[model samples]
Target chain A: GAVVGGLGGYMLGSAMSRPIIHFGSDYEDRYYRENMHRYPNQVYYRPMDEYSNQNNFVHDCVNITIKQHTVTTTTKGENFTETDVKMMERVVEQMCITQYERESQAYY
Target chain B: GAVVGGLGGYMLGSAMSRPIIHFGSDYEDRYYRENMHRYPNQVYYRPMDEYSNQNNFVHDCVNITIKQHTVTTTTKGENFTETDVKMMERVVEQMCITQYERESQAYY
Candidate 1:
């Protein structure tokens, strides 16, 4: 009797699980669609002779602006929904990962 | 004459750069060589039914232990060098990234 009751919980328990969400899948699509990036993501550091400190600083500031935008996002409640804000956060964090990759990969 | 001095600064300025290092590349090699991982890096999740909470806790604790060892290794001072400890930190952080990927990818 106890074993049969336990099996009942097994079938119903599936209801509690959440779906998998990609870290930046949607944003990646939009980034290209909107032409937000001048070059492809993989093109991060090349022509080593061409690196520019002022440009690097500008990119860093732009990243900060996107990060801040994700944090605020019409907080009195406007166009961006709660899910939209969260997706933006994921986009920003994924960008952090990519920025690190670009700098490090350029060296290798 | 002044333009020549500016050109000299350009050639000399290249001296200030640091070499790039992979965050977990060396540690990953050591990990496999030592047979540290029971499964390959990409084999993080599967079968859907095999996930274990207790084992997850165990892995988290182990990661923290490595992180702490990195912080305290031979403080007064032993075997592991400064570079060795830093490599361990990178390994752990990379592990964090992999873990996040696993959890999220499994859902998709």
Candidate 2:
């Protein structure tokens, strides 16, 4: 009787607690799986100091290269790649946008 | 005996199936919640056609206002706010970046 009761209870519980079924498009499913950590409304901001350091490092590196080539070059300005220019532009724009928005909202 | 056995089994199963525990920083949690859609390496792109439509709408709206005040407009151009220009810059850069990346990948 004890064995039968245990077995019966286990079977009932397992059957009743079957896993849930969900339906979604492949795109939606993939997105959900990839971004499960960012569900709902969450914001992540990189450290400002770190970004500043990175920006300065990139600038200094370019400056050093430009200085080395000054004897061979006539232009005083550094030649930046398309990627570098765009990245700097984004960095500046993003900083200002975030700063403006932060002043308007608390704890962003 | 049967009742005792069933109760014992249920309790054992319940205890064994306790929920999982996780730890995360507040910033990380918030970021996750807000960008759950852009977590890890997942990328989301706005419809190019829709963006084009919106851009044109904003442009035309600005142009119509400028045309109305041509006597006041020394330059044959519409005045765009910082927000509008930044949005456009981001839109163009993002579109190009995504396009370049897409060319290198499949089913992005």
Candidate 3:
């Protein structure tokens, strides 16, 4: 195969963005509960909501960056739910903006 | 050690999010353009901006979900730039909302 330009490889990327504070989830309530409401919703509850949200948020900070005029997005998790994926996009966007600015100042 | 609550676990998490369409960057610029703008920004432009931005976006959609009243955040890329990560957050948010709605309808 012939060599290409910035995106000479298959895909492309800028860098990795992670570290807001920590990462991971914690123990939560996973017990089933029967309600006496209108329909008596029988839903399960979980615990460790606080710690899980915080620790797990750390990993949420990751995505693709558009650098050197070349952009390449990477997928860390595909099986993730649509909701979780949506949040990741938000963080990725933030990283891209920051990367763009830093490069802008340094290069410019 | 005594068992705690939702924040009981060492960390935390909800669900993994991921999706979108196609992703990645493609061929375009990347040659070292000097003396151009008023500052003559000698920034090395790259190629594959389009494809890279697209392909990479695929992985950009991966974050923790807030399910069953439990929330968790994960760190996919810590070294990534702030800008890119921001973008991911945006996407993740969208996923959460969608996921929230679905769960709401189903659970309710």
lDDT (Cα, tens digit) per residue for candidate 2, span A1-108:
012111221111001111122225453333333322211111111222333343443333233222222222211012222322333233333333333333335421
lDDT of 2 at B99: 30
What lDDT is reached at residue A54 by model 2? 39
Per-candidate iRMSD: 25.0, 26.5, 19.8
C-alpha DockQ for predicted model 2 = 0.02
Residues A1-108, model 3: lDDT tens digits: 222243332222122222122223111010001000101111112122222442332222111111221122222232133433444444344433343444445643
Cα RMSD of all models vs. native, in order, equals 28.5, 33.2, 24.7
Question: Model 2, B13-74: lDDT tens per residue?
Answer: 00111112222644333323432221111111222333334344333323322222222212
lDDT of 1 by residue, B1-108 (tens): 012111221111011111122224453333223222111111111121232443443343233322222232221112223432333233333333333334345633
Q: What is the lDDT of residue B6 in candidate 1?
A: 18
Q: State which candidate has the highest DockQ.
A: 3
**Largest lDDT belongs to which candidate?**
1
